[PDB]
């Protein structure tokens, strides 16, 4: 039973620490269920984003070992380029021996420069892994370093502490009620089927169904740009002066509940949740992002939805289990 604490960053970015090499070099990474690769900046990276963050120096790890393999990854926000190498990764109190991870050479762009995080640790299916690189949780399960072939995650609300990723375990301490399990549509992302999206007893969206991934590496609740128009129009969101869609922070009171039906089970989203706010100003947690796929336009269930529902990712039976947090 591994335990990896996470830092809640402005209810927008949840990262955690890891160590790579011997002695171990520390790095803060994002635990991304929307990605499957693990990469940290390296000392052979001259990009403004690596100078800005910690750089893994293989020359100082006695258990490091190289490859000829190049790796490349595209994110809806960042881009990356590097080489693959093996070393021992320390996660949630578990020594992940012979883990293949990438070492950056380029981290192009503006966005990876302003980030409080150094790298990314994907928790999705090896199906979408760049360079067919073995994900961490797969390497843990394979080396029998975890008792169960599942992991669970708890995300903190209002900047509080308490955010955690439980490797090979489930803790009833985090949810109320019973664990509802939903089968996985398509193995790649943490892909689930949504049946509908309601408000006021009205199906404001996702009629006849839609696809959604459960991504802890996305901050807002995401969907096709036309579809969300309907939602923002409904909660009274406004694309303001500076380029944002805020809302009268007091208009939370009137506002009904947006409800998501998954596998026929109702999963409500209270306005205290779908509306982000600083005691100065209120935004919408809904974001339009057209994400085409063979399956269709993806809806992403990000931190707004995950903060309210304790999620279990079961690789054994390929299902996602949900339950309201405590």
Curated annotation (Swiss-Prot):
GO terms for molecular function: aspartic-type endopeptidase activity. Its main location: secreted. Transmembrane segments: none annotated. The keyword Metal-binding does not apply. It is found in: Secreted. Changing residue 32 to A: Loss of activity. Keywords: Aspartyl protease, Digestion, Disulfide bond, Hydrolase, Phosphoprotein, Protease, Secreted, Signal, Zymogen. The active site is at 32, 215. Minor amounts of the active enzyme occur with 'Ala-58' at the amino end. It is an enzyme of class 3 (hydrolase). Its EC number is 3.4.23.1. Residues 14-323 form the Peptidase A1 domain. The modification Phosphoserine is found at residue 68. GO terms for cellular component: extracellular region. It catalyses: Preferential cleavage: hydrophobic, preferably aromatic, residues in P1 and P1' positions. Cleaves 1-Phe-|-Val-2, 4-Gln-|-His-5, 13-Glu-|-Ala-14, 14-Ala-|-Leu-15, 15-Leu-|-Tyr-16, 16-Tyr-|-Leu-17, 23-Gly-|-Phe-24, 24-Phe-|-Phe-25 and 25-Phe-|-Tyr-26 bonds in the B chain of insulin. GO terms for biological process: digestion; proteolysis. Disulfide bonds join 45-50, 206-210, 249-282. Shows particularly broad specificity; although bonds involving phenylalanine and leucine are preferred, many others are also cleaved to some extent. Belongs to the peptidase A1 family. This is Pepsin A. It comes from Sus scrofa (Pig). The lineage of its organism: Eukaryota, Metazoa, Chordata, Craniata, Vertebrata. The gene is PGA.
């Amino acid at each position: 039973i591994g335990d990896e604490p996470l830092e809640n960053y402005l209810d927008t970015e949840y990262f955690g620490t890891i160590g790579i090499g011997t002695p171990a070099q520390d790095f803060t990474v994002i635990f991304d269920t929307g990605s499957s690769n693990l990469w940290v900046p390296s000392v052979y990276c001259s990009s403004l984003a690596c100078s800005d963050h910690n750089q893994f120096n293989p020359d100082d790890s006695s258990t490091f070992e190289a490859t000829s393999q190049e790796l490349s990854i595209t994110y809806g926000t960042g881009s990356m380029t590097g080489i693959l190498g093996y070393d021992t990764v320390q996660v949630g109190g578990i020594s992940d021996t012979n883990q293949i991870f990438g070492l950056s050479e380029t981290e192009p762009g503006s966005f990876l420069y302003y980030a409080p995080f150094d790298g990314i640790l994907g928790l999705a299916y090896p199906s979408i892994s760049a360079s067919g690189a073995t994900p961490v949780f797969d390497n843990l399960w394979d080396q029998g370093l975890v008792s169960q072939d599942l992991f669970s995650v708890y995300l903190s609300s209002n900047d509080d502490s308490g955010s955690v990723v439980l490797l090979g375990g489930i803790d009833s301490s985090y949810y109320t009620g019973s664990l509802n399990w939903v089968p996985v549509s398509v193995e790649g992302y943490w892909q689930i089927t949504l049946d509908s999206i309601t408000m006021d007893g009205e199906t404001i969206a996702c009629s006849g169904g839609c696809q959604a991934i459960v991504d802890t590496g996305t901050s807002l609740l995401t969907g096709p740009t036309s579809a969300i128009a309907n939602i923002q129009s409904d909660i009274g969101a406004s694309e303001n002066s500076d380029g944002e869609m805020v809302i009268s922070c007091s208009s939370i009171a009137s506002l009904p509940d947006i409800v998501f039906t998954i596998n026929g089970v109702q999963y409500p989203l209270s306005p205290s949740a779908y509306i982000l706010q600083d005691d100065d100003s209120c935004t919408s947690g809904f974001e339009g992002m057209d994400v085409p796929t063979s399956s269709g336009e993806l809806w992403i269930l990000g931190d707004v939805f995950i903060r309210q529902y304790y999620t279990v990712f079961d690789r054994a039976n390929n299902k996602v289990g949900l339950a309201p947090v405590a």
